[PDB]
C-alpha cells in the first residue's frame, strides 16, 4: 500500500 | 524520575513536532493576528479574488476548492506519517498496525492540526500564502457549501482551549496511538505506548495550564468528537462521489478512505 511506503522510507 | 521521564518524552515529541510540520500553530497565529513579519497573506473572499490568486499562490471553483483540500490533505498525511515515525516505540510496531494506526488516525490529526490554521473568520492555506474566508466557502454551491463549516465550529471551540505546540505534539501523539482502531492485529503494545502518552499529557496539562480545570478530561472528550468529525466527512464524501461525476480521488485518500 501507500501508507506502507510512505512508512518505510527513512 | 518517572516524572522528569514525562516532560523529556514531551520534549521529544516537541522537537519532532517541529521536524515534521512546517506551519506550527506558533507561526500560525502570529500571522492570523499581524504580528508576522513576512509579507501578508492574500485574501480570497470571492470568486473574483480567488481568480487573482490563483496566479499569486477548467473545472468549477467549488470542485476545484474541493479538490485543493485534498491535496493539502495528502501533504498533512505525509507530514504526519513522518511525525508518527518519531513517536517511542512506533517504527518497532508490527507494519500492518503502524499502517492501520494512520488509516483510521490521520483524519482526526488533520483536523486536529487546521484548527491551528483558522479563526471564526477563515482559513490559512498553503502554509500561510493565502487566506480564505470563512464567509466564502459556505458560498460555495451545495454539498459543496457545508464541506468546511462543521471544522470551523470545531475548531472556534477547540482553539477556545489555547493550547501551544508543546500540547498539540503529545495530544497528536496519544491519537495516533488508540488501540482501538479496527483490525489493529497486535493491540498491547500500542495501548502500553498510549498509556504512557497520556501520562505525558497530564502532567503537560497539569504544568502548562495550571489554572485550566478539567483540561485533561476535555482533550480527552475532543479525541471523540474529532471521530464524529470525520465519521460525518466521510458520509458527506459519500454524497458526492454520488451527486459528482467525472472527479478524480488521489490514490492515497482513496486508499484511506477504502473500508471506511
Ligand atoms: C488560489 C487558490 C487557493 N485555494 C484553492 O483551493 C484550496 C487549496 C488548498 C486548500 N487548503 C485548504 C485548507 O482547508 C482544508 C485543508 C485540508 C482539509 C480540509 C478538509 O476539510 O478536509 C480543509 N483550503 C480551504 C484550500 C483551498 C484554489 C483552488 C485556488
Ligand atoms: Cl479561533
Ligand atoms: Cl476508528
Same mark, same amino acid.
Given at each position: 500500500?501507500?501508507?506502507?511506503?510512505?512508512?518505510?522510507?527513512? | 524520575?518517572?516524572?522528569?521521564?514525562?516532560?523529556?518524552?514531551?520534549?521529544?515529541?516537541?522537537?519532532?513536532?517541529?521536524?515534521?510540520?512546517?506551519?506550527?500553530?506558533?507561526?500560525?497565529?502570529?500571522?492570523?493576528?499581524?504580528?508576522?513579519?513576512?509579507?501578508?497573506?492574500?485574501?480570497?473572499?470571492?470568486?473574483?479574488?480567488?481568480?487573482?490568486?490563483?496566479?499569486?499562490?477548467?473545472?468549477?471553483?467549488?470542485?476545484?476548492?474541493?479538490?485543493?483540500?485534498?491535496?493539502?490533505?495528502?501533504?498533512?498525511?505525509?507530514?504526519?506519517?513522518?511525525?508518527?515515525?518519531?513517536?517511542?516505540?512506533?517504527?518497532?510496531?508490527?507494519?500492518?498496525?503502524?499502517?492501520?494506526?494512520?488509516?483510521?488516525?490521520?483524519?482526526?490529526?488533520?483536523?486536529?492540526?487546521?484548527?491551528?490554521?483558522?479563526?471564526?473568520?477563515?482559513?490559512?492555506?498553503?502554509?500561510?500564502?493565502?487566506? =480564505?474566508?470563512?464567509?466564502?466557502?459556505?458560498?460555495?454551491?451545495?454539498?459543496?457549501?457545508?464541506?468546511?463549516?462543521?471544522?470551523?465550529?470545531?475548531?472556534?471551540?477547540?482553539?477556545?482551549?489555547?493550547?501551544?505546540?508543546?500540547?498539540?505534539?503529545?495530544?497528536?501523539?496519544?491519537?495516533?496511538?488508540?488501540?482501538?482502531?479496527?483490525?489493529?492485529?497486535?493491540?498491547?503494545?500500542?495501548?502500553?505506548?498510549?498509556?504512557?502518552?497520556?501520562?505525558?499529557?497530564?502532567?503537560?496539562?497539569?504544568?502548562?495550564?495550571?489554572?485550566?480545570?478539567?483540561?485533561?478530561?476535555?482533550?480527552?472528550?475532543?479525541?471523540?468528537?474529532?471521530?464524529?468529525?470525520?465519521?460525518?466527512?466521510?458520509?458527506?464524501?459519500?454524497?458526492?462521489?454520488?451527486?459528482?461525476?467525472? =472527479?478524480?480521488?488521489?490514490?492515497?485518500?482513496?486508499?484511506?478512505?477504502?473500508?471506511?
Amino acid at each position: 500500500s501507500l501508507l506502507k511506503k510512505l512508512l518505510l522510507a527513512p | 524520575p518517572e516524572s522528569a521521564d514525562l516532560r523529556a518524552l514531551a520534549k521529544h515529541l516537541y522537537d519532532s513536532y517541529i521536524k515534521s510540520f512546517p506551519l506550527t500553530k506558533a507561526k500560525a497565529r502570529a500571522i492570523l493576528t499581524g504580528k508576522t513579519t513576512d509579507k501578508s497573506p492574500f485574501v480570497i473572499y470571492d470568486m473574483n479574488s480567488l481568480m487573482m490568486g490563483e496566479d499569486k499562490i477548467s473545472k468549477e471553483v467549488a470542485i476545484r476548492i474541493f479538490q485543493g483540500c485534498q491535496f493539502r490533505s495528502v501533504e498533512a498525511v505525509q507530514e504526519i506519517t513522518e511525525y508518527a515515525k518519531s513517536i517511542p516505540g512506533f517504527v518497532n510496531l508490527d507494519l500492518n498496525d503502524q499502517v492501520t494506526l494512520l488509516k483510521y488516525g490521520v483524519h482526526e490529526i488533520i483536523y486536529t492540526m487546521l484548527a491551528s490554521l483558522m479563526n471564526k473568520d477563515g482559513v490559512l492555506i498553503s502554509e500561510g500564502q493565502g487566506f =480564505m474566508t470563512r464567509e466564502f466557502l459556505k458560498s460555495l454551491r451545495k454539498p459543496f457549501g457545508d464541506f468546511m463549516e462543521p471544522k470551523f465550529e470545531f475548531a472556534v471551540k477547540f482553539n477556545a482551549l489555547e493550547l501551544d505546540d508543546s500540547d498539540l505534539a503529545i495530544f497528536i501523539a496519544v491519537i495516533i496511538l488508540s488501540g482501538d482502531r479496527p483490525g489493529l492485529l497486535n493491540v498491547k503494545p500500542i495501548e502500553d505506548i498510549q498509556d504512557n502518552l497520556l501520562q505525558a499529557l497530564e502532567l503537560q496539562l497539569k504544568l502548562n495550564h495550571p489554572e485550566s480545570s478539567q483540561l485533561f478530561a476535555k482533550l480527552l472528550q475532543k479525541m471523540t468528537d474529532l471521530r464524529q468529525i470525520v465519521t460525518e466527512h466521510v458520509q458527506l464524501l459519500q454524497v458526492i462521489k454520488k451527486t459528482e461525476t467525472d =472527479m478524480s480521488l488521489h490514490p492515497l485518500l482513496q486508499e484511506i478512505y477504502k473500508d471506511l
